[PDB]
Design a protein around this ligand. Structure first.
Ligand SMILES: [Mg+2]
Ligand SMILES: [Zn+2]
Lengths: 331, 296, 83, 90, 237, 56, 697, 22, 221
């Protein structure tokens, strides 16, 4: 409302100003009620999906594992701590070892990786550790223990009976309710819901397919973007990109002739996980989903460790589709 | 305490009714079971005395609705209290999301040996301090207690009874041989609780730098003595934390207390964490009353 | 081991109990089966001595069998084998 | 919302078991002839209530003797010693 | 009237001189009524002796450090401040501690006059190096409670005499709390728990006894106001 | 959800559930395979140690 | 309370047949469209899942014959505000242009400043020159309902907490003393004389006989009329409805005068609660997170105390086996319990009944049924026969003690038109004087609800320098983050109204009171004051009044200019190191008492089709151990407890009795069995012709 | 005001409301 | 060392209320002692108050008496402000039999020997021409607030109307100190308590009973 209210509640409002405040507050109350109602639905679905992730074996004995950003490099050159380490690095078990400048090992394979060892790592001066995760646990039915790392409730290693799927679902769908909206990207609880439902984003935005420079053109009342391959032969043409959108800004705005990545996002917005799967494999979509959900939850300042979202995402990426029957039983 | 909980007598005589029935049959207050049932139902004077005996060391799950997450159900050792309102410990309000505007809670009762063991071991409040999501504590002292501890540990320059090294005419008049002497001088109107002074501690572990300075490697505290320029409030605060924990000497913002309890839960056993949290609660309320936080 | 004396449903301390077994679920079933043994000892004591040998440690005035169970677990009077 | 006013009352069933036990003990306080006459007269052994002629036949006496033993036993049980124990069940 | 429940004092001895008294069951809510009064009496009603001031050779205005020793002035002061000493002579008496040669000066080095005594002679106070001689005069009197560092009423009558605080009370730290024993058969009485920590002059038992005596006094004056008065008289049992 | 369709297709295919989830085992009332229900914990044997048993 | 009556009327409800359901409710129907101003209150709506679907009419609203909600405005012509009130619907509200009542009218209808606040058609707010205004509001507080207009300092409170205050101002209970609010609006008198719960002198006269039941008024011209009270009449929610007179035998009354207070009234002014002394410190954690502590003075002197009259009812319905007779004799009932019943079967007026007493003794025919051999033996040994006619007497529900105010007996013999089959229906009105208790819900007029954490004794309560103890102690942390500092202003003004002020106008009226009406330059102790809602006490006025209070009895200004006072700790003894806010706040006793909420069950009734425990406090029932709690205990890994709560506490029919028997005999609780919701399912699937079978191998 | 037996309750109304409450 | 032991001095301001000064108290002791004597006076001074009334006409509390303007409960509340001092420690029944036109002042209560009604003009009720009020109050000695004794627990006929009793003669008590505490360290506290009794007893007697109770409880130690 462009008036606006100019009186404090100590000075006492006038009539019309109180009327406008009533607009706002009544809508807020109704919205809070409905939001709680919806948080319930999300929790139910997440519990249904991750009811069968229970820790069976002590150790899957796998070697694969994700990497952690872990205090990215400074331009002048130092180790500035990554702010969101407590959600993305702590309570994890390393698969590899920490070695630097052909020096000695720092943290050996399979350590809880708490605060003192993270301080040791940042003191020794490395930035990326390959750590285990419930995404790449090789056990048949549910995760192992060392993949799940420290149980966040005990402070010790997770037990061999925990129903970590239910804990993950509850911890994800619990801090809803207090999840507001903003002032056409969806930016709140419905955004999270469409992420977990794997919908095509409301504000679908193009993603690159191969590197090279860009063939940028402003057509009639909207854009026309194509990718120049370096060996991708056929040029991928993105024609019907509206004039209402914006080009992606990073580091500067997207300029013509700029070198794009394999799956660089063309338009600032969000992308469909199906497409980034088909282009950049399973790893990329796992990272994309975790980053995208934790972007929402950091925006509200709620601390959720990533392994819960990783449990759910691992439950998403189970099955495969049959494009050729071979000759055996598969439609 | 964090594990205990209140339980109105008129609600523990109709939940444990079989237990109290058996017990006051065994003590020859009733000829048989029917007499015990009628007596209990009529709240005859000696039912209560048996009720305390059948209650002690027997958990009662205290659930709230909606059970948003895993800590919506927790097991407390009941403690018979009068009135008709379940007395809940204030440090589980954050887990239950329970303000006191008229919330209601459901008391269940485990029966079998396995169930009571489950409550006593798995779901007892003292054991489930940390949150399942991010590992931050949820028995952290919140709201009123944090204001108390802030006012306790904040520092006021220009307060009554500071340490000034001014000399020539009179000595420093800031040193205090022991926190006991400091408390005595605080009861008398000389020392403010938040003035900067130099105490000589013998039961508190100095911070790492001072330990490496005065002792280097192996300063064990119960006997050693060392001076520190701090406020009396911070000494009284660090007396709550265990012996092994180093001196803190900061201003207890809520994040500082979160970090302290996180470290103290990551390095020490759980029972120590529970007792320390309870002590922090007590000190926080006692010094929240004195903080004079009013609204006019 | 420095801490204030446990009181009530927290004696013995669970952190000293967990060092005896693998995980807390084993601790729960361990205590519960011992408590059933003890309760049966009390009841079966009416008849001849069965396979139920009850409190190895001396109990209190009126003490619940499960508290007896856990207190023995702490004092290392019992052993177990898992499945 | 329909309470089934026919369900097992839990306390009633256990109370009946306790009554069985206490009555059995008290009757065992009676003499062999007395215990037998009471159990048969009130069908505590099979649920069949035997009458005076049957009881006198299986003991080989006259029914008047059975009725006299019956009255004597009842009066003995009315004595507060073995009576107040079973009063509460009624 | 009848108290209906007679309170009973029972103590748990923790150290040689550290005690935890319990006084149950006090009727509601007398726990606090007598707990806070007892705390104040323990701290500020037991007579005792302490150091009032000291003077020292070799130091006139360089109040930072003493020549010939290792430890600085204020450390000597707050070592002397924690010194248990008993007295009978009411006038401030003087005591002399004095020693040449390097070594560790303790509490037993001091030579007391008639009546005054030290209850921990095996206490470290200071260190001397390289043939130094330390010679400090103590002014010891007896007092009550805790007095601040009394500002020198005279300006320079004793130019070397510098004052110090004086912790007279044999008790050091007293804290207390209440409980809610037996809510049902009794209707929620109270239970007072004390935690008294004294120096090695007197036992906590005697500390509590003296506090009881002094506290009896005043309320007994109040009773003498009207001796024929009715109150809650505990029934001897 | 969609109970009719699920049941009819399961019937047509003679489906056989193994009662191994933590939702199928909360319906039929038996012990759930999580926590203190799995056979590594539910079948532990508790016996007095021979030394204390001898002392007893 | 009377207000809840007058507000259940005047209620607008959009969720009716011919309207919309709570599921087809477009979220655009619940927002306050800018046409609601003066036609429907934006504040007062239920805070449940009904927000916006239920509201209440404005104070001045009036319904057009056609049914459109008209609204009064003042017609301003040629820049001249007149007094010819003209009513307008929403359409003409959109056509024309509307000014504000708090505008500088220059005592001639003339505006003063040309740039005037005004409303345009689409809800826009604009500064029109003062020539195009053709309508002005009739008064402030026109937008607002009846109940919300009774909140002093409303304009300072946030809309959320004001909404809560309005929704809890209808939930107070009628106390036994009913003290008028020290600080209020103008709507305490007009909300009682029009709520119908206050007898009104119809035509002028002089009272002759004033008695607790009847007032006889001698209407001047010959005629006389006897108004009759309703002493201790049960309301529709169990509360008292007394009406005591306020006149004396020689007073002259005029038509339209209040002649007798109602349940919540005192001299005719709506009074729902008491003026309790309040201090705003956080004390020892008992007033932690909205909890409230009380003196024991409130319990003792019966300050907060509500009478609750409950009704019990038993019908002597006919049955096939015979006729149910309400008679004293009952099969096993001994003369000891029977003592209360008089002869007909009803209790005697006054008998203190307790949970389990025989209010009405009714015996129902049962016919001959088999007696277990054991029972036959006992019956003969103890000389008690059968009297087959079974007992089904009414018994006071659990936790419903009290006296028996009155017994009403309806019978067919008296030709009373009972429903068919009922030869006699007797209703017994038990009643109890419930006092304030831990868990009872207390709230002010500003949404600041809270349960009673602890009723402290009177000596461990922070008392003033005068020795007067405070009566409640709210918390501080609840004030700033809820944006309802109304209670603070109400507090300060409250104290001003209690001690009485004296505007130091010796040097002329200070500017602080330059705009304050006359006969406010001085006031008496316990003098009643009122601040209308949107034209109330400007903060400056409160500051100056607070700094101009007269001393109590000695020379002692207890509350300084800041509004705070030096409290002594009643428990320890030392003064608090910082001054604390004290004052007199008007607080109510809400109808959420503990005795209506506490509940327990060990074994009770059981449902019919499924064999679960029943539901609700009317029966015993248990608490729904719902799906989310099952998730919670799956997450802990507690398997045995889940098996317990879902087999041998709810459904395992043969298992429950075994569990009870094993508990009484002192044995390990038996191993649980299959429930009775995995066997009804099995027989249904073997009934829809789907062979569902269990094969271990 | 305008009710015969009105509690004499002094008002802070700076304004003057013309129309009575209906 | 302080050679003056603490002393007490009466200072009457009115017959009902009175100030008491205790001096010279040890430094930092006044507040605690003022609080001790307050928590005693305000809690445990033995007194006497009506326990049960038995109005002749009515049978339960929630009703009216023909003729009286005050329903029974208002009579209960009015009576609960009475101040009667009893000498005997056994229940003693006082009677009141007002008739016809006039106010039932509590000064019309005929007291049994050994009790006295201190506030005479208390307005128990008002009686019109049909007025007839015959109440039989019961006095009883004790301390504190005793909730109304159940008519079931105690032996009582239907007529009995249980009434809460508040056995406490004290009305208002305050304390304050004027500690000089000068730099010379000749510090002392000068407690000034102020008792105010409800005319049942005198403040002096209240303070004396306080002294007795606290002396006993401290002799325990
Ligand atoms: Mg709430
Ligand atoms: Zn793994």
């Amino acid at each position: 409302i462009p008036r606006p209210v100019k009186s404090s509640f100590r000075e006492g409002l006038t009539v019309l100003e109180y009327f406008i405040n009533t607009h706002g507050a009544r809508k807020g109350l109704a919205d809070t009620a409905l939001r709680t109602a919806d948080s319930g639905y999300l929790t139910r679905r997440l519990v249904d999906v991750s009811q069968d992730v229970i820790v069976r074996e002590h150790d899957c004995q796998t070697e694969r594992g994700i990497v952690v950003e872990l205090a990215e490099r400074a331009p002048d050159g130092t180790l500035i701590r990554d702010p969101y380490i407590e959600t993305s690095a702590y309570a994890r078990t390393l698969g590899t070892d920490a070695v630097d400048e052909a020096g000695n090992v720092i943290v050996e394979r399979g350590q809880d990786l708490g605060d003192p060892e993270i301080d040791a790592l940042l003191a020794a001066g490395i930035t990326q550790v390959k750590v285990r995760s419930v995404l790449t646990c090789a056990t048949s039915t549910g995760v192992c223990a060392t993949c799940y790392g420290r149980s966040m409730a005990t402070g010790k290693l997770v037990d061999i009976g925990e129903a970590v799927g239910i804990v993950a679902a509850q911890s994800i769908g619990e801090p809803g309710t207090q999840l507001t909206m903003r002032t056409d990207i969806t930016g709140g609880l419905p955004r999270v819901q469409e992420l977990f439902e794997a919908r095509v984003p409301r504000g679908k935005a193009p993603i690159a397919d191969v590197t090279g420079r860009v063939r940028l053109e402003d057509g009639e009342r909207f854009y026309k973007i194509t990718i120049v391959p370096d060996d991708g032969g056929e040029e991928v043409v993105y024609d019907k990109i509206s004039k209402r959108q914006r080009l992606r800004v990073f580091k500067r705005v997207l300029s013509d002739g700029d070198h794009v990545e394999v799956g660089q996002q063309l338009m600032e917005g969000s992308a469909d996980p199906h497409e980034v799967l088909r282009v950049q494999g399973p790893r990329e979509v796992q990272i994309h989903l975790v980053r995208e959900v934790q972007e929402v939850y950091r925006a509200q300042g709620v601390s959720i460790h990533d392994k819960h979202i990783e449990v759910i995402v691992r439950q998403m990426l189970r099955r495969v589709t049959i494009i050729d029957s071979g000759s055996t039983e598969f439609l | 305490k964090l594990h205990q909980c209140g339980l109105p007598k008129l609600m523990a005589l109709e939940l444990f009714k079989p237990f109290v029935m058996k017990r006051l049959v065994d003590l020859n207050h009733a000829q048989n079971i029917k007499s015990a049932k009628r007596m209990v139902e009529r709240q005859r004077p000696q039912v209560w005395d048996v009720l305390e005996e059948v209650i002690a060391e027997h958990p009662v799950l205290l659930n709230r609705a909606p059970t948003l997450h895993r800590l919506g159900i927790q097991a407390f050792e009941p403690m018979l209290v009068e009135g008709k309102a379940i007395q809940l410990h204030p440090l589980v309000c954050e887990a239950f999301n329970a303000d006191f505007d008229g919330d209601q809670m459901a008391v269940h009762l485990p029966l079998s040996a396995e169930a009571q063991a489950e409550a006593r071991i798995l779901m007892l409040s003292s054991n489930n301090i940390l949150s399942p999501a991010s590992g931050r504590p949820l028995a952290m002292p919140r709201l009123d207690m944090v204001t108390g501890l802030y006012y306790l540990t904040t520092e006021v320059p220009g307060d009554t009874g500071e340490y000034q090294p001014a000399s020539g005419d009179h000595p420093e008049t800031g040193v205090y041989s022991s926190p006991a002497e400091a408390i005595m001088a605080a009861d008398r109107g000389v020392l403010s609780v938040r003035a900067k002074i130099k105490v000589r501690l013998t039961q508190l572990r100095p911070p790492v730098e001072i330990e490496a300075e005065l002792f280097g490697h192996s300063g064990w505290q119960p006997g050693d003595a060392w001076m520190a320029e701090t406020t009396l409030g911070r000494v009284m605060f660090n007396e709550l934390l265990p012996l092994g924990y180093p001196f803190v000497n900061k201003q207890m913002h809520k994040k500082v207390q979160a970090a302290i309890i996180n470290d103290l839960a990551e390095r020490y056993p759980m029972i120590v964490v529970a007792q320390t949290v309870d002590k922090l609660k007590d000190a926080g309320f006692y010094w929240a009353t004195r903080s004079g936080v009013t609204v006019s | 081991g420095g801490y204030d004396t446990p009181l009530g449903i927290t004696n013995p301390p669970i952190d000293e109990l967990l060092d005896r077994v693998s995980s807390k679920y084993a601790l729960v079933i361990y205590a519960a089966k011992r408590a059933r043994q003890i309760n049966d000892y009390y009841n079966q004591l009416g008849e001849g001595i069965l396979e139920y040998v009850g409190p190895l440690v001396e109990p209190g005035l009126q003490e619940k069998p499960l508290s007896i169970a856990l207190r023995e677990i702490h004092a290392d009077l019992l052993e177990h084998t898992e499945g | 919302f329909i309470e089934d006013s026919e369900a097992v009352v839990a306390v009633d069933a256990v109370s009946f078991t306790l009554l069985q036990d206490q009555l059995q003990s008290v009757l065992d306080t009676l003499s062999e002839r007395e215990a037998g006459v009471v159990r048969l007269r009130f069908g505590l052994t099979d649920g069949q209530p035997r009458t005076l002629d049957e009881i006198g036949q299986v003991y080989g006496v006259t029914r008047e003797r059975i009725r006299q033993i019956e009255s004597k036993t009842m009066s003995k049980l009315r004595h507060p010693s073995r009576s107040q124990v079973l009063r509460d069940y009624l | 009237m009848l108290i209906s429940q007679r309170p009973t004092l029972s103590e748990d001895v923790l150290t040689d001189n550290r005690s935890q008294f319990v006084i149950e069951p006090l009727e509601p809510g007398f726990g606090y009524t007598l707990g806070n009064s007892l705390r104040r009496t323990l701290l500020s009603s037991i007579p005792g002796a302490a150091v009032t001031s000291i003077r020292i050779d070799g130091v006139l205005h360089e109040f930072t450090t003493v020549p010939g020793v290792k430890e600085d002035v204020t450390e000597i002061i707050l070592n002397l401040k924690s010194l248990v000493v008993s007295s009978e002579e009411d006038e401030p008496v003087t005591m002399y501690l004095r020693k040449q040669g390097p070594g560790e000066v303790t509490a037993g080095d001091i030579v007391p006059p008639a009546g005054v005594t030290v209850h921990n002679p095996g206490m470290h106070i200071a260190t001397l190096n390289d043939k130094g001689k330390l010679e400090v005069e103590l002014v010891v009197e007896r007092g009550r409670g805790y007095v601040p560092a009394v500002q020198n009423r005279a300006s320079g009558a004793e130019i070397g005499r510098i004052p110090v605080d004086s912790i007279y009370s044999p008790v050091l730290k007293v804290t207390y709390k209440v409980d809610a024993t037996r809510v049902e058969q009794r209707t929620d009485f109270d239970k007072l728990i004390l935690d008294v920590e004294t120096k090695n002059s007197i036992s906590p038992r005697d500390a509590l006894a003296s506090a009881g005596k002094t506290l009896v006094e005043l309320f007994g004056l109040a009773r003498e106001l009207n001796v024929e008065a009715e109150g809650i008289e505990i029934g001897p049992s | 959800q969609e109970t009719t369709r699920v049941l009819t297709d399961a019937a047509i295919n003679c489906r056989s559930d193994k009662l191994n989830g933590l939702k199928e085992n909360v319906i039929i009332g038996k012990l759930i395979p999580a926590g203190t229900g799995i056979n590594r914990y539910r079948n532990i044997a508790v016996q007095p140690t021979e030394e204390a048993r001898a002392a007893a | 309370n009377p207000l809840s009556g007058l507000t259940h009327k005047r209620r607008l409800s959009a969720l009716g047949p011919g309207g919309l359901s709570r599921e087809r409710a477009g979220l655009e129907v619940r927002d306050v469209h800018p046409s609601h101003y003066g036609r429907m209150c934006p504040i007062e709506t239920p805070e449940g899942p009904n927000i916006g679907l239920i509201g209440s009419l404005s104070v001045y609203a009036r319904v057009n014959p056609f049914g459109f909600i008209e609204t009064p405005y003042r017609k301003v012509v040629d820049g001249v505000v007149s007094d010819e009130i003209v009513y307008l619907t929403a359409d003409e509200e959109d056509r024309h242009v509307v000014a504000q009542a708090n505008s500088p009218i220059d005592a001639d209808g003339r505006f003063v400043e040309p740039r005037v606040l005004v409303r345009r058609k689409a809800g826009e707010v604009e500064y029109v020159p003062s020539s195009e205004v053709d309508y002005m509001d009739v008064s402030p507080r026109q937008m607002v309902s009846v109940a919300t207009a009774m909140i002093p300092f409303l304009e300072h409170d946030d809309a959320n907490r004001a909404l809560m205050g309005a929704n809890m101002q209808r939930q107070a209970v009628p106390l036994v003393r009913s003290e008028a609010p020290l600080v209020g609006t103008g709507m305490e008198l007009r909300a009682a004389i029009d709520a119908g719960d206050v007898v009104v002198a119809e035509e002028s006269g002089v009272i002759e006989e004033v008695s607790a039941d009847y007032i006889t008024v001698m209407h001047d011209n010959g005629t006389r009329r006897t108004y009759r009270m309703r002493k201790f009449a049960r309301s529709n929610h169990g509360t008292c409805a007394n009406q005591c007179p306020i006149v004396d035998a020689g007073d002259r009354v005029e038509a339209g005068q209040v002649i007798a207070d109602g349940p919540c009234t005192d001299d005719g002014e709506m009074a729902l609660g008491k003026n309790l002394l309040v201090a705003i410190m956080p004390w020892e954690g008992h007033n932690y997170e909205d909890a409230i502590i009380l003196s024991n003075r409130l319990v003792e002197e019966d300050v907060l105390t509500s009478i609750h009259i409950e009704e019990h009812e038993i019908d002597a319905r006919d049955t096939k086996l015979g006729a149910e007779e309400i008679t004293r004799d009952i099969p096993n009932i001994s003369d000891e319990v029977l003592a209360d019943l008089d002869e007909r079967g009803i209790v005697r007026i006054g008998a203190e009944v307790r949970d389990g007493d025989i209010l009405v003794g009714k015996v129902t025919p049962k016919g001959e049924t088999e007696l277990t051999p054991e029972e036959r033996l006992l019956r003969a040994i103890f000389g008690e026969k059968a009297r087959e006619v079974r007992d089904t007497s009414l018994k006071v529900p659990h936790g419903e003690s009290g006296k028996v105010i009155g017994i009403r007996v309806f019978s067919r013999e008296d030709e009373d038109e009972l429903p068919a089959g009922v030869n006699e229906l007797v209703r017994v009105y038990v009643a109890q004087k419930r006092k304030i208790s831990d868990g009872d819900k207390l709230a002010g007029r500003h949404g600041n609800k809270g349960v009673i954490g602890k009723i402290l004794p009177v000596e461990d309560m922070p008392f003033l320098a005068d020795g007067t103890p405070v009566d409640i102690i709210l918390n501080t942390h609840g004030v700033p983050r809820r944006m309802n500092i109304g209670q603070i202003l109400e507090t300060h003004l409250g104290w001003c109204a209690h001690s009485g002020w004296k505007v130091d106008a010796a040097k002329g009226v200070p500017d602080w009171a330059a705009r304050l009406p006359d006969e406010l330059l001085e006031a008496q102790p316990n003098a009643i004051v009122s601040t209308p809602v949107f034209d109330g006490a400007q903060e400056a006025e409160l500051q100056g009044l607070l700094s101009c209070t007269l001393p109590n009895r000695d020379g002692d200004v207890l509350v300084d200019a800041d509004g705070k006072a030096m409290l002594f700790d009643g428990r320890s003894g030392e003064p608090f190191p910082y001054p604390v806010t004290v004052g007199y706040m008007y607080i109510m006793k809400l109808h959420h008492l503990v005795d209506d909420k506490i509940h327990a069950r060990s074994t009770g009734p059981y449902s019919m089709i499924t064999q679960q425990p029943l539901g609700g406090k009317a029966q015993f029932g248990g608490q729904r151990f719902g799906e989310m709690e099952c998730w919670a205990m799956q997450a802990y890994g507690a398997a045995y407890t889940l098996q317990e709560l879902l087999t041998i506490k709810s459904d395992d029919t043969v298992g429950r009795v075994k569990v009870y028997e094993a508990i009484v005999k002192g044995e390990n609780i038996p191993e649980p069995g299959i429930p009775e919701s995995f066997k009804v399912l099995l027989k249904e699937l073997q009934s829809l012709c789907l062979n569902v079978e269990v094969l271990s191998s | 005001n305008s009710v015969p037996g009105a509690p004499n309750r002094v008002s802070f109304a700076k304004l003057r409301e013309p129309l009575e409450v209906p």
